[PDB]
């Protein structure tokens, strides 16, 4: 049956291609050409958080824009007060190889997972005042590459077995399992309304899911190598990706196709972390090289750099109020740029 | 408000005291990746030195992503068992990885009593400096040293002295001595003297 079933899908995928070529009538760069550029945007390291023995892998701002949780290969998860530089908690982990960390939108829990395939949920506001693991979501057969909280009960996790999964922390078993990727999924990002979430994997494909129905709405294939980072536009009707192709691309959920690419010939290092500013005008992208670029997300022209890490930038995140941009690196130091 | 910031700055003071009692135990232990439930840890101790060997058990056979985690590791223990050309092509990737370019690779070779997969073996004669242990023919010694010279073709073609391969034949004593040679050559390299 594969005689025809594999070749007609090439015609089926082909009639999808020209449908996207029928929508492309004016590139994003041409539309934004009239808009006056932002010039040079020079941020400087306000805070430099220290105390991590090993390279940081992920950080996540709290919704209050003050606290932030950083995960390191040392096996320590630390919550910092970006304002006073003080450390609030120093949660020690069982498995030292944690490749992700999340901060609940209520500030009550933090998650972290990695090469142990487990997603541990740590309860901060406990009755004894300390911090300990509440649940260990053990249902994945590969490493955990991303973790995002929807509520204090629903957490969607991206794993290295090509599957994302929606969980229920009060029970501990997967409410939904998202399948469709052909490579280990590297990052996800929840939508502003938390009804959908895009997800990038090592097959150069980004898939827009639906948390409720558990299906795959759209699939975006514009990159050429492993997509390492993904982030939703603050509007919720677009998202940006960063791959080992040394390029960033802005896809559109309503146009189903790529709108703009953010590449330069001087950069050959793959983007390792992508985030948007509060207005969605800047696209802060971390790189294999220590410097992190700042892209005018409308004009694709670079508008600044943050070359202070001195090591590969593992993570990157803008606050909800858009004040600071905490960047984490394998140098073991998390720098706040305003 | 000045008082709760004092209580906060005391919590940072109790934390930084624990982050210092952990920095000592972190620098004392030496990580080891054993290449070949998502990860298994073996904690052995040779001469009161804490070694932590981490076997990637439940991970898939696509390593291009989770292998980058083990770059700060002391040595990548690489056990070898066309299962041989697959290990030569894997070692060539562990060696020529930008992240693992500074990571030495201890290498073990299991062999018991080779021409169909490698034709140069009909033209390879064991070097005279090879010392065979008594108890087996000089033909497997010609085979044990051909594979060893196949991994050193990759170990020497690249690497300006940042990482070193340590091939062996098959315990924990050889990993202990090889880890000492890895750190000593790292200190000498920092002083720029070699």
């Amino acid at each position: 049956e594969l005689d025809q079933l594999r070749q007609e899908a090439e015609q089926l995928k082909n009639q999808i291609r020209d449908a996207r070529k029928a929508c492309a009538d004016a590139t994003l760069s041409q539309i934004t050409n009239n808009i006056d550029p932002v010039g040079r945007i020079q941020m400087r390291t306000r805070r430099t958080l220290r105390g991590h023995l090993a390279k940081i892998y992920a950080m996540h701002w709290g919704t209050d824009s003050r606290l932030l949780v950083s995960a390191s290969q040392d096996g320590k998860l630390i919550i910092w007060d970006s304002y006073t530089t003080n450390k609030v908690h120093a949660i020690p982990l069982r498995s030292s190889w944690v490749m992700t960390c999340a901060y609940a939108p209520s500030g009550n829990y933090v998650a972290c997972g990695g090469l142990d395939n487990i997603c541990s949920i740590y309860n901060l506001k406990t009755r004894e005042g300390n911090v300990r693991v509440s649940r260990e979501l053990a249902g994945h057969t590969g490493y955990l590459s991303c973790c995002r909280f929807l509520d204090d009960n629903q957490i969607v996790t991206s794993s290295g077995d090509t599957t994302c999964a929606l969980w229920d922390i009060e029970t501990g078993q997967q409410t939904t399992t998202f399948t469709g990727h052909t490579g280990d999924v590297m990052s996800l990002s929840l939508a502003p309304d938390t009804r959908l979430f895009v997800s990038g994997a090592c097959d150069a494909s980004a898939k827009l899911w639906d948390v409720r129905e558990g299906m795959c709405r759209q699939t975006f294939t514009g990159h050429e190598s492993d997509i390492n980072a993904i982030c939703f536009f603050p509007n919720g009707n677009a998202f940006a990706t960063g791959s080992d192709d040394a390029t960033c691309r802005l896809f559109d959920l309503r146009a189903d196709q790529e709108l703009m690419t953010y590449s330069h010939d001087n950069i050959i290092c793959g983007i390792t972390s992508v985030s948007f500013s509060k207005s969605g005008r800047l696209l802060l992208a971390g790189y294999d090289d220590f410097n992190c670029n700042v892209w005018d997300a409308l004009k694709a022209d670079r508008a600044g750099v943050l070359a202070g890490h001195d090591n590969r930038v593992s993570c990157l995140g803008v606050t909800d109020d858009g004040m600071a941009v905490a960047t984490g690196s394998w140098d073991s130091f998390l720098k706040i740029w305003n | 408000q000045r008082n709760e910031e004092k209580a906060q700055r005391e919590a940072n003071k109790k934390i930084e005291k624990q982050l210092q009692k952990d920095k000592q135990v972190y620098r004392a232990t030496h990580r080891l990746l054993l290449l070949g439930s998502g990860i298994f840890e073996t904690k052995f101790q040779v001469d009161k030195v804490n070694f932590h060997m981490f076997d990637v058990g439940g991970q898939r056979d696509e390593r291009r992503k989770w292998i980058q985690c083990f770059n700060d590791v002391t040595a990548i223990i690489f056990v070898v068992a066309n299962r041989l050309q697959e290990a030569l092509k894997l070692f060539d990737s562990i060696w020529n990885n930008k992240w693992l370019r500074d990571t030495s690779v201890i290498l073990f070779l299991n062999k018991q009593d080779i021409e169909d997969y490698f034709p140069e073996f009909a033209r390879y004669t064991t070097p005279e400096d090879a010392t065979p242990e008594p108890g087996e023919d000089p033909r497997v010694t010609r085979a044990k040293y051909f594979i060893r010279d196949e991994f050193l073709r990759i170990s020497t073609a690249s690497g300006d002295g940042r990482h070193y391969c340590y091939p062996h034949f098959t315990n924990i004593r050889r990993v202990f001595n090889d880890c000492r040679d890895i750190i000593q050559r790292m200190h000498l390299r920092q002083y720029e003297l070699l």
Partner: nanobody, 126 residues
């Protein structure tokens, strides 16, 4: 969309000669180190050959040395494999793999068909 649609292959008598092509699209062909892997009937995938993005840096497996020859045309985005002196045990499905990241010297292309930047394969029966 990284599409590696190869051609060639079929049925040849033992001792014949084939020429496997590989029309690559969806990526800058001149930045990636291309490969050739095959899956023998009843066995896992094994690596056959490769070639660096420079154009002249070639490696083979021991059993195809002297008989096979890989060559790429960056100006046309095509990868070839001139097969000569076909042995009976050299029958397999030949995939036109690609190393994952550009401007690198390491590759992880034999990964139990779960590799994404690979072709569908061409049957070569001898």
């Amino acid at each position: 969309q990284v599409q590696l649609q190869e051609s060639g292959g079929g049925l040849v008598q033992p001792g014949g000669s084939l020429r496997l092509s590989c029309a690559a699209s969806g990526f800058t062909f001149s930045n990636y180190k291309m490969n050739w892997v095959r899956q023998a009937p009843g066995k896992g995938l094994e690596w056959v050959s490769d070639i660096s993005q420079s154009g002249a840096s070639i490696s083979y497996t021991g059993s195809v040395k002297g008989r096979f020859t890989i060559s790429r045309d960056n100006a046309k985005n095509t990868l070839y494999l001139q097969m000569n002196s076909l042995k009976p045990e050299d029958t397999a499905v030949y995939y036109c793999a690609r190393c994952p990241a550009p401007f690198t010297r390491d590759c992880f292309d034999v990964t139990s068909t779960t590799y994404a930047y690979r072709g569908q394969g061409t049957q070569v029966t001898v």
